[PDB]
Amino acid sequence: VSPPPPIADEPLTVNTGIYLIECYSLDDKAETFKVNAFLSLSWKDRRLAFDPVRSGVRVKTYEPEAIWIPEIRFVNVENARDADVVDISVSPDGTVQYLERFSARVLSPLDFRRYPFDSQTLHIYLIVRSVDTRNIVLAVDLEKVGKNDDVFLTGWDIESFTAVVKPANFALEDRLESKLDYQLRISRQYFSYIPNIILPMLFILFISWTAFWSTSYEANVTLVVSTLIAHIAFNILVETNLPKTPYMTYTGAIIFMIYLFYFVAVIEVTVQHYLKVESQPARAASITRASRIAFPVVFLLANIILAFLFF
Amino acid sequence: VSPPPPIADEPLTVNTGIYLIECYSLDDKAETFKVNAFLSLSWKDRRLAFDPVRSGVRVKTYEPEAIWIPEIRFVNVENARDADVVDISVSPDGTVQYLERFSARVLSPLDFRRYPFDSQTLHIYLIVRSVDTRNIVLAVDLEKVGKNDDVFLTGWDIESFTAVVKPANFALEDRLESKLDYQLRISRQYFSYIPNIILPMLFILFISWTAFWSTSYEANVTLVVSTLIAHIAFNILVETNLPKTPYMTYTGAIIFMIYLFYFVAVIEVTVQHYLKVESQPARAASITRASRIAFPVVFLLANIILAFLFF
Amino acid sequence: VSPPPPIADEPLTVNTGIYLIECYSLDDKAETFKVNAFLSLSWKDRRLAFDPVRSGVRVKTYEPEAIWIPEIRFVNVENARDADVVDISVSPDGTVQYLERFSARVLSPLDFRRYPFDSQTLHIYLIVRSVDTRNIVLAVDLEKVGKNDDVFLTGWDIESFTAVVKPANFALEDRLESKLDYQLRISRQYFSYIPNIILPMLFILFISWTAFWSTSYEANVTLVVSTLIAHIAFNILVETNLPKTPYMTYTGAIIFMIYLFYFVAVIEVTVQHYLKVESQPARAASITRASRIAFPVVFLLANIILAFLFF
Amino acid sequence: VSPPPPIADEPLTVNTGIYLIECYSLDDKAETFKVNAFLSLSWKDRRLAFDPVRSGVRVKTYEPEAIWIPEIRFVNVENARDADVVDISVSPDGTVQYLERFSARVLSPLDFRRYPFDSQTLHIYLIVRSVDTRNIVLAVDLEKVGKNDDVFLTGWDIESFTAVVKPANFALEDRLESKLDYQLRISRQYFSYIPNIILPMLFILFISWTAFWSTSYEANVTLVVSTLIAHIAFNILVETNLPKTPYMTYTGAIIFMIYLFYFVAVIEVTVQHYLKVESQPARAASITRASRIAFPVVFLLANIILAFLFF
Amino acid sequence: VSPPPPIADEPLTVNTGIYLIECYSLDDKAETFKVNAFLSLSWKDRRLAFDPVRSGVRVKTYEPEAIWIPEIRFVNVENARDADVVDISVSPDGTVQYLERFSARVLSPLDFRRYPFDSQTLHIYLIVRSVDTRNIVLAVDLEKVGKNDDVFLTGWDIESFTAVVKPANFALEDRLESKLDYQLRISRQYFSYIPNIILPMLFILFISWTAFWSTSYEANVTLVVSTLIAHIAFNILVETNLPKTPYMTYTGAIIFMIYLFYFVAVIEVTVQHYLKVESQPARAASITRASRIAFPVVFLLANIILAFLFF
Ligand SMILES: [Cl-]
Ligand SMILES: [Cl-]
Ligand SMILES: [Cl-]
Ligand SMILES: [Cl-]
Ligand SMILES: [Cl-]
Ligand code: NA
Ligand code: NA
Ligand code: NA
Ligand code: NA
Ligand code: NA
Ligand code: NA
Ligand SMILES: [Xe]
Ligand SMILES: [Xe]
Ligand SMILES: [Xe]
Ligand SMILES: [Xe]
Ligand SMILES: [Xe]
Ligand SMILES: [Xe]
Ligand SMILES: [Xe]
Ligand SMILES: [Xe]
Ligand SMILES: [Xe]
Ligand SMILES: [Xe]
Ligand SMILES: [Xe]
Ligand SMILES: [Xe]
Ligand SMILES: [Xe]
Ligand SMILES: [Xe]
Ligand SMILES: [Xe]
Ligand SMILES: [Xe]
Ligand SMILES: [Xe]
Ligand SMILES: [Xe]
Ligand SMILES: [Xe]
Ligand SMILES: [Xe]
Ligand SMILES: [Xe]
Ligand SMILES: [Xe]
Ligand SMILES: [Xe]
Ligand SMILES: [Xe]
Ligand SMILES: [Xe]
Ligand SMILES: [Xe]
Ligand SMILES: [Xe]
Ligand SMILES: [Xe]
Ligand SMILES: [Xe]
Ligand SMILES: [Xe]
């Protein structure tokens, strides 16, 4: 089999469509997602044209091996898509309506800067390499681009699924290449983070600040050290569910900042005790009393600054 | 091969059945389950009809490639089902009886709101896409829908396996699709959760409350902080075995609530000591004595409220 | 290809054999094991009869596709067995000697009640479905059922590998089914559990009991809390290597019981201190002195009871 | 099919090119990386030459099975590359231009000596085996060696992708083998390590040094022990993300060194207390005062020395 | 195809060779290793003989399907080897030179008794089942047994790769079987274990012994308990990287022994305090002073005994 011959010198327009059946396994560390979807391809092949009056048939069904099919690939896939041809239907003018169901593990980078309050744009790049006889160009049939109402991505809200209608046509290894961008806009469900990580982490930080109402060095050491160990456990638990970004993330920034509050609490607790021993409790008293107001105020302002910078 | 032609204009009814052989690997985080089962398909194909007298046989066996077979798919599968055709048989009137054995990893969302005392309804959606020549509608042959008596799903009780007999017929990309809902009702075996998580977690909370019978700030700090660290360990262990839900779960609610009891214990422990230092032990005495009754009472009532809201 | 014809009305007897080459990956949580073995099959197909005078050769060798082969399956497998035909030998009478090497991940439930001192019976169910022309029945050729002397299952002792010679012949979806039970009896190597989990866990419990020789509330609090945290770590480590059973396991029971000893130690430690403060150390003394004998004695008796109930 | 015959006695030059489409999954422990790329091969086959005038075509497209294709393999792959032929084109002089898209898991050893500030050189070894009829030699077509601008390797900066143009021609199993080295130079994004591991770990070490401003043995013990436990947690977290090297790594060296600072702090804390009890606080005072300067100074020098040795 | 006929009654000698290309993924818990290697097979097939002066060609290249190839398998593999035939060459006299490249996951048991200072012997068992027409026997062509100079197994030193030249010929299921033992001698790189596990673990044990220079029960309790918790963390981290052996390992023995030192320290710390309270500090003094010498001495001697027993 060979590709359809051009009437003049025009390139072959292959009309595409992706209808998402299932969305699953969004790996944050791997920056991957698994997809089960329909892929619809359409092009005109004059060699397949027929008379609908004489044949008595409106549509002719073919096997993939029987007719010429354009080699459509995905750019950002781990391995080649697991595909099963659903249908091939030819119209009297020779317009082929190909349909296949596929599953793929797609690599799409993620922006963790606003985590866990971040939104993403997942991509699926459709590509066709032009042949020596004639150039192939991709198009979007919006009537055949969509998603199942039941499509659910665990811990994520699916906003939109659209395609950038204008293909990215470019030279690659002395042959033409037509690329299409299928974009899946999603937003993270941040709810669980609040009672599981954020609030527990804040409560333990506030427990550390009860040392501003104590003169017992021994007890203070125990408070700050313990609550600090709990914070380390949270910092680790958090960093396990995220990849190593070459930038600061919102959660990361907050967590880091909290480490400084623990350091300064240790210093306060230390200074207070040194002074108490040095028979200067009145001076120690002023520092402890100031800390009671300073620590919450500076914590609140630092957070307002941080939130402003990130959002 | 082409589909059977209609006698009038009626759609082709494909009679389905699923007989569960093995149920395994119910992943809570992934919201998946693996299944090994028999799939049976039956439809009338007149072109295959024969006379028993002339042929000398009451049944005719064919190879899948030899005859027309409807393209039946599962909606909620990760990848295409690993299937092996068991038998194909034609009755004299042309009633095809197809059977295959398959294995699939099925995606079915789970409702963790009542965890670990929750019950689920797993789904298997059977689907058929109609062809340009004729419309295909799915049916359930209840005589061919069942499950092996030995079918066991680890940590779960299997209640029922039934099919919603009326198919969900809908338009998708200008072609009729017929969907069938195979429902597997299961209920979690909550037993292990009691001696492994619930009771240990309650015991450590009750240990924290022994600080209401102590005036030793240093000992109290040690109690509350330690028991709190143990609670964090339990909260982490729990959240590892569950996905991030955009809603509160029963276990989650309880765990969260317990964090507040730890906070108020710290406050009590702090206030008591401040007052002792302030040379006001009689006032601290009243607070500590009240706490001895208040903490259990408020804990019990809070739990009754919570259980009421969730169940 | 069609099945062989009966001389009278008798069913086709397919002789079976399983020779275990490798046993590995016994997943306790999954209740699975991987197996590499030889599957032998032998039946008479007179249609393949030959004269070795004419044909030249005494025994003929066929390709699986060339001749009729019974559709033999495994009931309790995750996916279809990875099989590679070793040999197909036909003797002049038409007796087929089919040999194949396979690998499979078998699901066989496990009884954790006596863990880590439990023994299991792993199963491999061979099954054949009877066709329209004639019924197929399975048989065991004991001369072809065995295992390699080198077969080792890590952390387990392999006792026996036998087959229940009488097949379970039953009706299923209006057709006959012949099932065979290949049983692999194994017993857990409990050795490692003693120096790794049991003894460490006992020592830490005994450390808590040194609080019965101390009057220092602050030191006692530290003992019981610490050792309790160590016990939680052990309880977690243990429950990670085990599935969630709807029943109590021996290790589980012991671990749970130990939690009660920690609770009562906390109570003792609390009561002793309260009394000390209440200026009643002589009464506190009696309780502490009693506890020194009571805790070991009650621990020993409770363990005798528990071991009696479980074994 | 047989290989092209030599015009004289010259070997067959197969021109190679690798164009990286996707780079992903760099496993540090496994010392592997997954790759999705184009493999472009080109050789001259005179048997396939044609005249453009009589043929009416400037180029001829073939199926892989139709013509002779050199058996090109990768040396350092886990399993054989998942490959799909894109396009085979023959020019009038018989210059075959082959293109295939592949995915492979490549094993390339990593040098962790300067971790997490290390740079690597990933390798892809292309190999061809010479046949009895003629010797086959590999060449690099630099015009066909490249990478996509979007190629991103998570937690790594991609520097270059080049090929060592001169092949390593050597004997293996009595046949000549031509090897080519495709090198991918990368450098680790060390950013995340600073706020996640390095700084937290330094802060906790500095917290232990507050014991040089305390005379409270009990408080000091609590400081050094706690901070030490936090350091152990960090050391474990670090060694989980790295393989077991038979050499010291930079992070490893630092971590190890810090353990010695903790040991000497314990000794100081111990000696100070012993002396305090021995009614020699003036001598203990000198040691504690010296330690305040000695510990940071000796720490800074130790780090300068270490950084010098490693960079 | 049928096997080569015997000239007399002699068995068919198949000359084997394994040339290791890549060694990777040595799983200690699984007792597996992955291998990428060349498999060479050589046997005389007189039916394939040809004249050299008449035919012109000295060597004839055949496709695997075209000629008879012996069914060579690996005994100790998880699944069947992923193999790709590289070359088949027939000599004038009919000697066949077959070569294939394979990848396999091999199960070879490991002896952890001297861990992490242990050496292993990995095995690859080549096997051939004899046919009804003639017996097949395996041989080793040492000229074709080897390994790549670049072959690296992470955390291991590769000593030798040899084959036991005399095959293990035995009866199995009424047919002859010829087995060959390919042995890969390796030794563990124990370096990393010293700064990561051994030294940290020793240091924390020595920290516990500072309680012999303290009379502060409260401080002593904190020392012994803390350091004990750190030891538990190390014991767990160690047992995670090792399988459950029915025997004692060197590391296991040491770790276990250390638990007894912690127990006796607790007893010492307890007895010392009891005596202090009992107004007998002079007697407590003798015990504490003795412990200062006893604990290191007994620790050193116990280790000498242990090392002697294990090595
Ligand atoms: Cl693709
Ligand atoms: Cl499907
Ligand atoms: Cl099977
Ligand atoms: Cl390859
Ligand atoms: Cl094999
Ligand atoms: Na085609
Ligand atoms: Na068909
Ligand atoms: Na067959
Ligand atoms: Na070819
Ligand atoms: Na062959
Ligand atoms: Na303490
Ligand atoms: Xe997408
Ligand atoms: Xe978070
Ligand atoms: Xe805490
Ligand atoms: Xe956050
Ligand atoms: Xe502190
Ligand atoms: Xe602050
Ligand atoms: Xe189901
Ligand atoms: Xe739970
Ligand atoms: Xe605790
Ligand atoms: Xe719960
Ligand atoms: Xe507290
Ligand atoms: Xe409360
Ligand atoms: Xe078995
Ligand atoms: Xe156990
Ligand atoms: Xe402990
Ligand atoms: Xe046990
Ligand atoms: Xe306690
Ligand atoms: Xe007790
Ligand atoms: Xe590469
Ligand atoms: Xe690091
Ligand atoms: Xe800490
Ligand atoms: Xe570092
Ligand atoms: Xe210390
Ligand atoms: Xe120092
Ligand atoms: Xe090997
Ligand atoms: Xe420690
Ligand atoms: Xe070790
Ligand atoms: Xe060791
Ligand atoms: Xe102790
Ligand atoms: Xe000792």
Numbering used by the authors:
A (entry chain E), B (entry chain A), C (entry chain B), D (entry chain D), E (entry chain C): 5 to 315
Excerpt from the paper describing this PDB structure:
To improve the understanding of molecular interactions between xenon and transmembrane receptor targets, we investigated xenon binding with the Gloebacter violaceus ligand-gated ion channel (GLIC), a member of the pLGIC family, using X-ray crystallography under pressurized gas. Previously, the sensitivity of GLIC to gaseous anesthetics has been studied using 2-electrode voltage clamping techniques and this revealed that GLIC currents are inhibited by clinical concentrations of xenon. GLIC, whose X-ray structures has been solved in open, locally-closed (LC)–inactive- and resting-state conformations, is extensively used to identify binding sites of general anesthetics, channel blockers, alcohols, and other allosteric modulators in pLGICs. Here, we show by X-ray diffraction that xenon has multiple and specific binding sites in GLIC either in the open and LC (inactive) conformations, and that these binding sites differ between the two conformations.
Xenon-bound GLIC open and LC structures were obtained from crystals pressurized with 2 MPa (20 bar) of xenon and analysed by X-ray crystallography at 3.1 and 3.4 Å resolution respectively. In GLIC open form, xenon is found at three close but different locations in an intra-subunit cavity located in the upper half of the TMD. This cavity is lined by residues from a single subunit with contributions from helices M1 (Y197, I201, I202 and M205), M2 (V242), M3 (Y254, T255, I258 and I259), M4, the apex of the β6- β7 loop (Y119, P120, F121) and the M2-3 loop (N245). The cavity is accessible from the lipid bilayer, it penetrates the interior of the subunit along a direction that points towards the ECD-TMD interface. The first two locations of xenon are observed at the pocket entrance and were modelled as alternative poses of the same xenon atom with 0.5 occupancy each. The third xenon atom with 0.9 occupancy is deeply buried within the cavity in a highly hydrophobic environment. The xenon atoms are all engaged in van der Waals interactions with the hydrophobic side chains of surrounding residues and the alkyl chains of the lipid molecule. In GLIC open form, the intra-subunit binding site can be considered as a common anesthetic binding site, since it can bind not only xenon, but other anesthetics like propofol, desflurane or bromoform. In GLIC open form, xenon binds between M1 and M2 helices from one subunit and M2 helix from the adjacent subunit in the inner part of the TMD while in GLIC LC form, xenon binds between M1 helix from one subunit and M2 and M3 helices from the adjacent subunit in the outer part of the TMD. The second one, named minor interfacial site, is present only in the GLIC open form and is located in a small hydrophobic cavity in the middle of the TMD.
